[PDB]
């Protein structure tokens, strides 16, 4: 109901090809052309040279299973630094005497 | 470093790009079919040419990956369709003239009409105009005027266009290393790469000929039954050992005999099963027709329909302002977008059609997890066959009494079921010899065994032998019967209709044995039975990614087509037709002619 629009949204891309698998918690923004075989590429598209970034087709008419989902992943890591963020507290009534 | 790594990389990227453009190409055709506008007619041609030229550009890089170095079966099947260059193998002159002949023959078929001999001012087009009149017309001359005069300005006019259609399509198969163009359509059943399941292309010629031999004793008894009812009308032109006229088959080309079911009713003193008058009292609309059919797929274990399917359905035609084609069709766009364009009225046929139209969508849901190249039926006959077995279980009296259409006190006996089996036989039995006749004729002409002068000489000669139909007026080589046909002129597969009958009855017998149904096969109902839906779901998700001979064994246990389910399902009717034909002659002769005495 938000991202998908009539005509398609090409702003959101993804990396289809990479020479290997990414390590945990690694972000690679490199646009370098992926080389499948031994044929030289040099940034020019051609035989065995493919542009890794591909587009997500976004329209409201697509089926429910393939509809885009906005995913928010929270990374919980406990280091040796002093702890700050904590859960919400609860305040009760005050009585005297 | 290996070619398999380079071929798989090409296929991984191609599946994404080909799926994006095919969705926009199918969406442009959807907006054009549902709404006639000047913007949609241009979008269909623009999006259609972008997807058509996309396969031509990717075919250049597809031929650079030989299949000899690929040991994977799924990779070679995805590259099997991309290896073909299509029309690029033809010369620049023959490639441009090929689309011209296809568009010209399609335009003449749409713009063709026969003016009334009695009313020269009024001129009616073939569809719907002439196809509707030929259905209910009982006259001898009125049917002959529309049947004979059509091929005069069409069959004779399309002959030079058909001669060029044969020459252009033969040069494409020769560049593709095919024996002829008749072998091109037989390449859909081709199976290679698996030990023991290999299926040769030339094997289909022997298969359709051998399976048709066991069809003859069932067809001869039905052909004599129809001839006995129409014998009293014209005893001079209709011989007991002769053949039936061509124009009296119930329509133009004699594809279906259902139009003759009115006069062929064995018992007219008993009611017939009809849900039309039942749905009127229940007050049902087009919204609940698809809803009741969706619960049929849930009872067998198959998944339901997505919310976007029922919301985007087109339930009617809003007048002439926005016009849509009422021909029922199931359109599969992609990425989970499923839509059906049909004009839904309240009739008994629309109820069975709803199970057929939703059968294609339910069939597409199983293999939808496959790549774009692997999304398809295992052959051309499995597309429509899956939707038919869904409608066969709905037409049974058991399923109609479940939801409340038919009264539970309705008497079901031999007299009621024989009347029902005859209506299906006119559509089923009558189609097989006509489909085997015209398809074998195309294979012989495309091969070169029949000279151009003998086209019509062998057409009617082999027609009395197969379907037992003789022409009232003899025709010369100028006329062409297949040129006027919808499928031949539009270059669509005509063989898918013959094999469909054999594939749908095999599945009908196998699913009823899994659910432990007893009695005759036409009494079987697959509703509420989840055991048969699980065995079928395994094959439905395979598609063409696996050999159709292997996927067929996982259901019926057979490696090829078999006539045994065809005989058993029609066995109650075959026993009744044999007793009624004792007073007549079973079979026909090819030496009888209406103009030769």
XYZ file of C-alpha atoms in Angstrom:
694
model
C 0.000 0.000 0.000
C 3.030 2.330 0.085
C 6.121 1.280 -1.879
C 4.340 -0.331 -4.831
C 2.870 2.121 -7.340
C 1.315 2.018 -10.797
C 4.008 1.541 -13.429
C 6.649 -0.065 -11.205
C 9.241 1.248 -8.762
C 12.854 0.745 -9.859
C 14.440 2.646 -6.952
C 14.872 -0.532 -4.868
C 17.559 -2.849 -6.259
C 19.345 -5.997 -5.098
C 22.629 -7.793 -5.745
C 21.911 -10.916 -7.794
C 25.464 -12.175 -8.436
C 28.615 -12.242 -6.323
C 31.820 -14.265 -6.576
C 31.295 -15.697 -3.073
C 29.012 -15.548 -0.034
C 28.939 -12.518 2.248
C 30.207 -12.744 5.809
C 27.785 -12.144 8.700
C 26.966 -8.448 9.161
C 28.760 -7.311 6.001
C 27.507 -4.674 3.549
C 28.963 -4.492 0.029
C 27.846 -1.536 -2.109
C 30.386 -2.173 -4.885
C 28.872 -1.785 -8.359
C 31.762 -3.579 -10.102
C 30.580 -5.808 -12.938
C 30.420 -9.479 -11.984
C 32.598 -11.770 -14.111
C 31.109 -15.247 -14.493
C 33.835 -16.810 -16.637
C 37.392 -16.023 -17.676
C 36.334 -13.490 -20.327
C 37.538 -9.954 -19.482
C 34.780 -7.440 -18.737
C 36.344 -4.045 -17.872
C 32.978 -2.547 -16.935
C 31.457 -3.222 -20.376
C 28.434 -5.510 -20.558
C 28.773 -8.511 -22.835
C 29.378 -12.243 -22.948
C 29.921 -13.640 -19.424
C 29.694 -10.073 -18.062
C 26.549 -9.186 -16.124
C 25.377 -6.153 -14.176
C 24.717 -7.467 -10.647
C 22.010 -5.045 -9.521
C 18.481 -6.015 -10.555
C 15.156 -4.254 -10.036
C 12.127 -5.152 -7.913
C 8.885 -4.856 -9.856
C 6.416 -3.113 -7.519
C 2.731 -2.717 -8.410
C -0.415 -3.305 -6.320
C -1.608 -5.901 -8.861
C 0.959 -8.551 -7.883
C -0.016 -11.535 -5.772
C 0.042 -11.437 -1.991
C 2.959 -13.851 -1.601
C 5.338 -11.700 -3.655
C 4.205 -8.362 -2.207
C 7.175 -6.423 -0.781
C 7.552 -6.564 2.995
C 9.431 -3.870 4.896
C 11.724 -5.759 7.281
C 13.231 -4.212 10.419
C 15.943 -6.406 11.952
C 17.101 -5.509 15.468
C 20.643 -6.656 16.302
C 21.036 -7.411 20.020
C 24.694 -7.524 21.087
C 26.029 -7.459 24.656
C 29.548 -6.020 24.848
C 31.825 -5.110 27.755
C 30.666 -1.478 27.572
C 28.336 -0.189 30.310
C 24.708 -1.134 29.704
C 22.265 1.702 29.037
C 19.166 0.668 27.085
C 16.708 -1.214 29.297
C 13.057 -2.206 29.242
C 10.285 0.119 30.401
C 9.717 0.447 34.132
C 6.454 0.636 36.089
C 5.557 3.229 38.725
C 3.138 2.305 41.514
C 1.180 4.345 44.048
C 2.806 6.019 47.054
C 1.359 5.415 50.527
C 2.416 6.907 53.863
C 1.906 6.209 57.582
C 35.406 -22.329 -15.213
C 33.111 -25.037 -16.557
C 30.379 -24.296 -19.089
C 27.780 -25.444 -16.548
C 28.731 -22.533 -14.284
C 28.506 -20.116 -17.217
C 25.201 -21.572 -18.435
C 23.601 -21.506 -14.979
C 24.720 -17.894 -14.499
C 23.032 -16.931 -17.776
C 19.850 -18.740 -16.726
C 19.786 -17.169 -13.253
C 19.844 -13.648 -14.707
C 17.538 -14.466 -17.633
C 14.763 -15.749 -15.355
C 14.476 -12.329 -13.702
C 14.563 -10.209 -16.864
C 12.231 -12.454 -18.870
C 9.735 -12.527 -15.988
C 9.602 -8.726 -15.691
C 8.875 -8.069 -19.372
C 6.436 -10.979 -19.709
C 4.301 -9.523 -16.912
C 4.040 -6.112 -18.585
C 3.374 -7.791 -21.936
C 0.560 -9.894 -20.470
C -0.775 -6.903 -18.528
C -1.000 -4.789 -21.688
C -3.028 -7.573 -23.308
C -5.262 -7.702 -20.222
C -6.109 -3.992 -20.349
C -6.775 -4.335 -24.086
C -9.080 -7.347 -23.720
C -11.083 -5.910 -20.814
C -11.264 -2.399 -22.307
C -11.132 -1.346 -25.961
C -9.241 1.955 -26.187
C -6.703 3.625 -28.447
C -4.167 3.613 -25.600
C -4.451 -0.111 -24.844
C -4.081 -1.204 -28.481
C -0.742 0.618 -28.654
C 0.437 -0.660 -25.263
C -0.203 -4.270 -26.295
C 1.874 -3.831 -29.454
C 4.619 -1.930 -27.617
C 4.889 -4.325 -24.669
C 4.409 -7.256 -27.039
C 7.304 -6.246 -29.289
C 9.603 -5.595 -26.321
C 9.090 -9.150 -25.055
C 9.252 -10.644 -28.558
C 12.532 -8.897 -29.383
C 13.871 -9.788 -25.923
C 13.886 -13.512 -26.707
C 15.568 -12.759 -30.042
C 18.419 -10.865 -28.367
C 18.875 -13.535 -25.686
C 18.848 -16.292 -28.319
C 22.205 -15.028 -29.605
C 23.868 -15.664 -26.237
C 21.936 -18.924 -25.773
C 23.495 -20.649 -28.797
C 26.972 -19.912 -27.377
C 26.484 -22.483 -24.566
C 26.636 -25.988 -26.079
C 24.583 -28.621 -24.272
C 27.234 -31.329 -24.743
C 29.270 -30.047 -21.775
C 26.227 -29.750 -19.467
C 25.510 -32.866 -17.404
C 22.464 -31.354 -15.661
C 18.991 -32.224 -16.926
C 17.239 -29.104 -15.608
C 19.803 -26.813 -17.257
C 19.503 -28.379 -20.717
C 15.702 -28.103 -20.635
C 15.849 -24.376 -19.865
C 18.334 -23.916 -22.722
C 16.311 -26.148 -25.066
C 13.737 -23.430 -25.777
C 16.309 -20.622 -25.866
C 18.540 -22.504 -28.316
C 15.914 -22.136 -31.048
C 16.237 -18.861 -32.953
C 12.559 -18.820 -33.938
C 12.071 -16.853 -37.148
C 15.667 -15.572 -37.131
C 16.787 -18.643 -39.093
C 14.596 -17.563 -42.012
C 15.802 -15.059 -44.589
C 15.009 -11.371 -44.161
C 12.465 -11.548 -46.991
C 10.789 -14.735 -45.751
C 10.762 -13.529 -42.134
C 8.911 -10.287 -42.899
C 6.441 -11.982 -45.260
C 5.705 -14.670 -42.654
C 3.998 -12.255 -40.256
C 2.096 -10.762 -43.199
C 0.500 -14.082 -44.181
C -0.394 -14.850 -40.557
C -2.035 -11.440 -40.132
C -3.799 -11.628 -43.504
C -5.293 -15.083 -42.925
C -6.395 -14.012 -39.442
C -8.006 -10.825 -40.773
C -9.917 -12.619 -43.543
C -11.228 -15.133 -41.000
C -12.495 -12.304 -38.784
C -13.832 -10.131 -41.628
C -15.228 -13.058 -43.624
C -18.986 -13.223 -44.079
C -21.644 -14.938 -46.187
C -24.485 -12.797 -47.502
C -27.955 -14.325 -47.334
C -28.886 -15.782 -50.754
C -32.525 -14.819 -50.173
C -31.607 -11.418 -48.653
C -28.587 -10.018 -50.538
C -28.730 -6.851 -48.418
C -28.269 -8.629 -45.076
C -24.768 -10.110 -44.752
C -23.900 -11.998 -41.566
C -20.385 -12.650 -40.289
C -19.262 -16.166 -39.399
C -18.741 -15.578 -35.670
C -21.164 -15.277 -33.933
C -23.570 -14.856 -36.826
C -23.099 -17.958 -38.960
C -21.926 -20.178 -36.091
C -25.156 -19.446 -34.197
C -27.525 -20.135 -37.104
C -25.868 -23.433 -38.068
C -26.450 -24.765 -34.537
C -30.266 -24.732 -34.452
C -30.937 -24.884 -38.212
C -32.811 -28.045 -39.221
C -33.146 -27.053 -42.891
C -31.245 -28.854 -45.640
C -30.804 -25.866 -47.965
C -30.274 -23.197 -45.292
C -27.363 -25.159 -43.820
C -25.889 -25.925 -47.248
C -26.000 -22.280 -48.360
C -23.888 -21.152 -45.398
C -21.571 -24.182 -45.493
C -20.857 -24.254 -49.239
C -20.671 -20.521 -49.981
C -18.207 -19.857 -47.145
C -15.306 -21.819 -48.650
C -16.077 -20.247 -52.043
C -14.881 -16.781 -50.981
C -12.642 -18.053 -48.148
C -11.269 -21.518 -48.871
C -10.603 -20.617 -52.500
C -9.195 -17.211 -51.518
C -6.895 -18.564 -48.788
C -5.400 -21.227 -51.082
C -2.530 -19.036 -52.403
C -2.030 -17.804 -48.838
C -1.967 -21.390 -47.550
C 0.569 -22.451 -50.189
C 2.927 -19.725 -48.975
C 2.211 -20.716 -45.367
C 3.504 -24.226 -46.083
C 6.685 -23.120 -47.868
C 7.710 -20.546 -45.250
C 7.228 -22.839 -42.251
C 9.093 -25.723 -43.907
C 12.255 -23.640 -44.318
C 12.241 -22.918 -40.580
C 12.282 -26.608 -39.639
C 15.066 -27.367 -42.125
C 17.313 -24.731 -40.541
C 16.446 -26.184 -37.110
C 17.537 -29.690 -38.242
C 13.957 -31.000 -38.265
C 12.625 -33.429 -40.860
C 9.651 -31.191 -41.717
C 7.261 -28.681 -40.177
C 4.969 -31.537 -39.157
C 7.789 -32.776 -36.933
C 8.028 -29.333 -35.304
C 4.734 -29.753 -33.449
C 5.765 -33.296 -32.496
C 8.854 -31.876 -30.765
C 6.745 -30.812 -27.786
C 6.466 -34.459 -26.692
C 10.196 -35.038 -27.270
C 11.972 -36.607 -24.281
C 15.733 -37.164 -24.129
C 18.404 -37.386 -21.447
C 16.846 -40.077 -19.218
C 17.537 -43.789 -19.658
C 14.459 -45.773 -20.680
C 12.028 -42.829 -20.718
C 13.240 -41.452 -24.067
C 10.324 -40.677 -26.398
C 11.014 -40.247 -30.110
C 9.235 -37.628 -32.201
C 8.232 -40.169 -34.850
C 6.671 -42.366 -32.162
C 3.646 -40.048 -31.955
C 2.575 -40.981 -35.495
C 2.363 -44.648 -34.489
C 0.770 -43.797 -31.129
C -2.182 -41.777 -32.443
C -2.733 -44.404 -35.148
C -2.679 -47.387 -32.770
C -4.873 -45.803 -30.087
C -7.413 -44.818 -32.753
C -7.859 -48.469 -33.769
C -9.478 -49.334 -30.432
C -11.608 -46.183 -30.738
C -13.227 -47.476 -33.958
C -15.580 -50.075 -32.370
C -16.852 -47.427 -29.945
C -17.187 -44.766 -32.656
C -18.894 -47.036 -35.204
C -21.737 -47.782 -32.783
C -22.240 -44.091 -31.988
C -22.034 -43.020 -35.638
C -24.713 -45.580 -36.518
C -26.894 -44.350 -33.644
C -26.801 -40.743 -34.868
C -27.431 -41.861 -38.456
C -30.478 -43.892 -37.394
C -32.160 -40.838 -35.863
C -31.601 -38.628 -38.925
C -32.425 -41.400 -41.416
C -36.185 -40.759 -41.348
C -35.702 -37.116 -42.379
C -33.838 -37.727 -45.668
C -33.786 -41.452 -46.508
C -32.593 -40.799 -50.071
C -29.471 -38.780 -49.242
C -28.690 -40.702 -46.029
C -27.862 -44.373 -46.707
C -27.888 -46.952 -43.884
C -24.430 -48.182 -44.942
C -23.427 -44.729 -46.218
C -22.121 -41.593 -44.541
C -23.707 -38.519 -42.992
C -23.650 -35.165 -44.821
C -21.012 -32.625 -43.839
C -23.365 -29.673 -43.290
C -25.661 -31.584 -40.893
C -22.953 -32.234 -38.265
C -24.397 -29.392 -36.144
C -21.888 -26.650 -37.000
C -19.579 -25.534 -39.802
C -16.613 -27.896 -39.395
C -18.316 -30.670 -37.416
C -16.006 -30.387 -34.412
C -18.615 -31.154 -31.731
C -21.865 -33.109 -32.068
C -23.429 -31.580 -28.929
C -25.781 -29.553 -31.149
C -27.431 -32.851 -32.156
C -28.156 -33.898 -28.556
C -31.701 -32.502 -28.787
C -32.925 -34.951 -31.440
C -30.790 -37.903 -30.261
C -32.325 -38.105 -26.751
C -32.969 -41.828 -26.118
C -35.816 -41.229 -23.639
C -37.812 -38.010 -23.798
C -40.326 -39.139 -21.177
C -37.838 -38.629 -18.327
C -36.503 -35.336 -16.926
C -32.921 -34.207 -17.459
C -30.480 -32.805 -14.912
C -30.309 -29.010 -15.146
C -29.035 -26.556 -12.530
C -30.255 -23.470 -14.417
C -33.725 -23.392 -12.851
C -32.208 -24.327 -9.477
C -29.829 -21.352 -9.346
C -32.663 -18.926 -10.150
C -34.637 -19.836 -7.028
C -31.448 -19.783 -4.944
C -30.684 -16.270 -6.298
C -26.968 -16.641 -6.977
C -24.749 -14.079 -8.702
C -21.326 -14.229 -10.340
C -19.662 -13.591 -6.966
C -20.839 -16.819 -5.312
C -20.358 -19.007 -8.407
C -16.572 -18.808 -8.095
C -16.850 -18.999 -4.298
C -18.646 -22.356 -4.354
C -16.102 -23.628 -6.892
C -13.210 -22.516 -4.672
C -14.431 -24.795 -1.875
C -14.160 -27.712 -4.313
C -10.389 -27.206 -4.471
C -10.202 -27.037 -0.669
C -11.974 -30.382 -0.198
C -9.253 -32.142 -2.229
C -6.397 -30.491 -0.309
C -5.405 -27.919 -2.926
C -4.728 -24.350 -1.735
C -7.420 -21.693 -1.987
C -7.395 -18.555 -4.150
C -5.527 -15.397 -3.190
C -7.408 -12.232 -2.269
C -6.147 -10.553 -5.436
C -7.659 -13.293 -7.594
C -11.278 -12.788 -6.514
C -10.936 -8.991 -6.328
C -9.553 -8.553 -9.862
C -11.976 -10.971 -11.543
C -14.177 -9.575 -14.317
C -17.704 -10.841 -13.688
C -19.662 -9.177 -16.528
C -19.529 -6.795 -19.490
C -20.610 -3.230 -18.599
C -22.520 -2.649 -21.821
C -20.990 -1.297 -25.013
C -19.120 1.580 -23.321
C -16.375 -0.747 -22.053
C -16.378 -3.960 -24.093
C -14.664 -7.196 -23.087
C -14.335 -10.542 -24.840
C -16.832 -13.035 -23.417
C -14.820 -16.050 -24.598
C -13.762 -17.803 -21.362
C -9.991 -17.701 -20.932
C -7.638 -18.059 -17.960
C -4.882 -15.443 -18.222
C -1.671 -16.064 -16.262
C 0.459 -12.904 -16.083
C 3.129 -13.710 -13.512
C 4.505 -13.158 -10.026
C 1.314 -14.473 -8.459
C -1.061 -12.346 -10.559
C -3.985 -14.571 -11.586
C -7.016 -13.260 -13.480
C -9.855 -14.667 -15.586
C -11.871 -12.762 -18.208
C -15.324 -14.263 -18.746
C -18.907 -13.040 -19.082
C -20.795 -14.886 -16.340
C -24.516 -15.515 -16.790
C -26.741 -17.998 -14.955
C -26.700 -21.274 -16.913
C -25.829 -24.917 -16.374
C -22.783 -24.570 -18.652
C -21.322 -21.578 -16.793
C -21.247 -23.695 -13.631
C -19.124 -26.383 -15.294
C -17.086 -23.695 -17.070
C -16.227 -22.036 -13.744
C -14.541 -25.257 -12.611
C -12.673 -25.344 -15.930
C -11.502 -21.723 -15.836
C -10.443 -22.011 -12.192
C -8.745 -25.309 -13.041
C -6.082 -23.512 -15.068
C -5.403 -21.058 -12.233
C -5.266 -23.869 -9.674
C -2.910 -25.730 -12.025
C -0.591 -22.708 -12.256
C -0.264 -22.444 -8.460
C 1.583 -25.753 -8.032
C 4.551 -25.133 -10.350
C 4.627 -21.361 -9.724
C 7.712 -21.977 -7.556
C 9.644 -22.998 -10.688
C 11.745 -20.547 -12.727
C 10.085 -18.616 -15.543
C 11.533 -21.016 -18.117
C 10.217 -23.989 -16.109
C 6.697 -22.552 -15.674
C 4.531 -24.355 -18.252
C 2.593 -27.566 -18.780
C 4.541 -30.738 -19.469
C 2.923 -30.691 -22.925
C 0.203 -28.908 -24.897
C -2.505 -31.374 -23.831
C -2.096 -31.058 -20.064
C -3.206 -27.404 -20.075
C -6.904 -27.990 -20.777
C -7.018 -31.550 -19.404
C -6.536 -30.401 -15.799
C -9.567 -28.112 -16.026
C -11.771 -30.803 -17.568
C -11.369 -33.404 -14.807
C -12.519 -30.708 -12.381
C -15.698 -30.183 -14.418
C -16.368 -33.914 -14.844
C -16.681 -34.412 -11.083
C -19.012 -31.404 -10.861
C -21.396 -32.682 -13.552
C -21.997 -35.883 -11.574
C -25.319 -36.091 -9.683
C -23.419 -36.792 -6.452
C -21.701 -33.393 -6.384
C -24.886 -31.534 -7.345
C -26.842 -33.057 -4.451
C -24.059 -32.092 -2.023
C -24.354 -28.302 -2.359
C -28.122 -28.401 -2.885
C -28.599 -27.718 -6.603
C -30.256 -31.058 -7.394
C -33.046 -32.348 -5.178
C -32.008 -35.281 -2.941
C -35.116 -37.219 -4.040
C -34.088 -37.159 -7.715
C -34.264 -40.674 -9.145
C -30.906 -41.859 -10.504
C -31.049 -44.992 -12.659
C -29.867 -46.365 -16.003
C -32.317 -44.254 -18.015
C -30.973 -41.055 -16.440
C -27.274 -41.919 -16.728
C -27.387 -43.218 -20.315
C -28.909 -39.880 -21.324
C -26.020 -38.098 -19.588
C -23.290 -40.295 -21.085
C -24.610 -39.644 -24.598
C -24.297 -35.866 -24.232
C -20.651 -36.182 -23.187
C -19.986 -38.716 -25.959
C -21.062 -36.260 -28.666
C -18.452 -33.795 -27.384
C -15.794 -36.419 -26.551
C -16.192 -39.374 -28.922
C -17.108 -37.207 -31.910
C -13.982 -35.079 -31.460
C -11.372 -37.865 -31.617
C -11.758 -39.022 -35.262
C -12.119 -35.424 -36.456
C -8.976 -34.392 -34.561
C -6.992 -37.417 -35.758
C -8.159 -36.756 -39.328
C -7.160 -33.111 -39.741
C -3.905 -33.420 -37.787
C -2.727 -36.423 -39.812
C -3.659 -34.562 -43.004
C -1.451 -31.620 -42.022
C 1.441 -33.981 -41.258
C 1.140 -35.553 -44.720
C 0.932 -32.261 -46.636
C 3.785 -30.644 -44.702
C 5.897 -33.752 -45.358
C 5.344 -33.665 -49.127
C 3.559 -36.996 -49.625
C 0.465 -35.256 -51.059
C 0.932 -33.066 -54.167
C -0.818 -29.704 -54.233
C -3.486 -31.056 -56.599
C -4.407 -33.982 -54.314
C -5.002 -31.862 -51.182
C -8.787 -32.011 -51.560
C -8.660 -35.422 -53.250
C -7.082 -37.012 -50.168
C -9.065 -34.797 -47.769
C -12.537 -36.167 -48.519
C -11.234 -39.637 -49.415
C -9.701 -40.120 -45.961
C -12.702 -38.373 -44.378
C -15.193 -41.130 -45.200
C -12.714 -43.661 -43.793
C -12.148 -41.909 -40.447
C -15.210 -39.869 -39.439
C -17.508 -41.253 -42.146
C -18.515 -37.915 -43.683
C -19.106 -37.296 -47.398
C -19.522 -33.960 -49.188
C -22.899 -33.076 -50.742
C -21.195 -30.942 -53.420
C -17.850 -32.239 -54.765
C -14.967 -29.780 -54.489
C -11.872 -29.329 -56.639
C -8.354 -28.407 -55.507
C -9.278 -24.702 -55.355
C -11.083 -25.069 -52.025
C -9.147 -25.534 -48.785
C -11.057 -26.857 -45.777
C -8.381 -26.327 -43.056
C -7.688 -22.761 -44.235
C -11.023 -21.590 -42.803
C -10.495 -23.379 -39.475
C -9.715 -21.213 -36.452
C -6.702 -23.190 -35.228
C -5.023 -23.781 -38.600
C -5.359 -20.172 -39.778
C -4.146 -18.786 -36.428
C -1.224 -21.266 -36.214
C -2.301 -23.016 -33.008
C -1.668 -26.613 -31.976
C -4.406 -28.909 -33.288
C -2.954 -32.098 -31.753
C -3.626 -30.998 -28.158
C -7.316 -31.896 -28.549
C -6.767 -35.580 -29.383
C -4.308 -36.351 -26.582
C -6.393 -34.356 -24.086
C -9.170 -36.964 -24.149
C -6.739 -39.774 -23.316
C -4.941 -37.817 -20.578
C -8.111 -36.671 -18.795
C -9.627 -40.165 -18.565
C -6.411 -41.694 -17.216
C -6.408 -39.106 -14.429
C -10.127 -39.693 -13.839
C -9.568 -43.417 -13.268
C -6.443 -42.971 -11.124
C -7.889 -40.389 -8.724
C -11.013 -42.490 -8.138
C -8.911 -45.541 -7.244
C -6.943 -43.517 -4.683
C -10.116 -42.338 -2.917
C -11.569 -45.890 -2.884
C -14.708 -45.175 -4.908
C -16.764 -48.182 -6.001
C -19.144 -48.682 -8.899
C -19.157 -47.164 -12.381
C -16.633 -44.445 -13.123
C -19.179 -41.765 -14.042
C -20.594 -42.076 -10.510
C -17.223 -41.108 -9.006
C -16.842 -37.777 -7.212
C -13.486 -36.496 -5.955
C -15.010 -33.991 -3.521
C -14.308 -34.307 0.221
C -11.523 -36.785 -0.641
C -8.074 -35.470 0.297
C -6.220 -38.665 -0.666
C -6.500 -38.151 -4.434
C -5.466 -34.494 -4.266
C -2.110 -35.350 -2.703
C -1.100 -37.806 -5.436
C -2.047 -35.298 -8.144
C -0.338 -32.317 -6.481
C 3.049 -34.020 -6.881
C 2.796 -33.955 -10.682
C 1.120 -30.539 -10.952
C 4.173 -28.788 -9.480
C 6.625 -30.517 -11.842
C 5.563 -28.815 -15.068
C 7.841 -29.456 -18.028
C 10.960 -29.446 -15.823
C 10.580 -33.249 -15.816
C 9.727 -35.611 -18.697
C 5.985 -35.991 -19.184
C 6.476 -39.757 -19.471
C 8.027 -39.788 -15.990
C 5.411 -37.505 -14.417
C 2.610 -39.574 -15.956
C 3.926 -42.732 -14.273
C 3.732 -41.078 -10.839
C -0.072 -40.813 -11.193
C -1.565 -43.505 -13.442
C 1.476 -45.792 -13.522
C 1.559 -45.711 -17.334
C 4.449 -44.560 -19.522
C 2.280 -43.674 -22.546
C -1.293 -43.134 -23.687
C -3.823 -45.914 -23.134
C -7.382 -46.448 -24.376
C -8.470 -48.584 -21.386
C -9.863 -45.607 -19.385
C -11.623 -44.425 -22.552
C -13.460 -47.752 -22.867
C -14.346 -48.213 -19.187
C -15.852 -44.745 -18.721
C -17.972 -45.233 -21.869
C -18.643 -48.929 -21.125
C -22.227 -48.360 -19.829
C -23.010 -46.463 -23.040
C -21.222 -48.958 -25.303
C -23.420 -51.807 -24.048
C -26.617 -49.841 -24.716
C -25.590 -48.687 -28.201
C -24.758 -52.251 -29.262
C -28.280 -53.488 -28.486
C -30.012 -50.603 -30.285
C -27.846 -50.976 -33.415
C -28.699 -54.662 -33.943
C -31.532 -53.649 -36.286
C -29.115 -51.415 -38.242
C -25.707 -51.873 -39.868
C -22.688 -51.206 -37.649
C -20.093 -49.274 -39.638
C -20.059 -47.369 -42.909
C -18.660 -47.686 -46.426
C -16.458 -45.230 -48.312
C -17.901 -46.091 -51.749
C -21.208 -44.254 -51.171
C -21.760 -40.687 -52.371
C -24.889 -38.502 -52.398
C -24.319 -37.350 -55.997
C -23.179 -40.790 -57.245
C -25.985 -43.329 -57.635
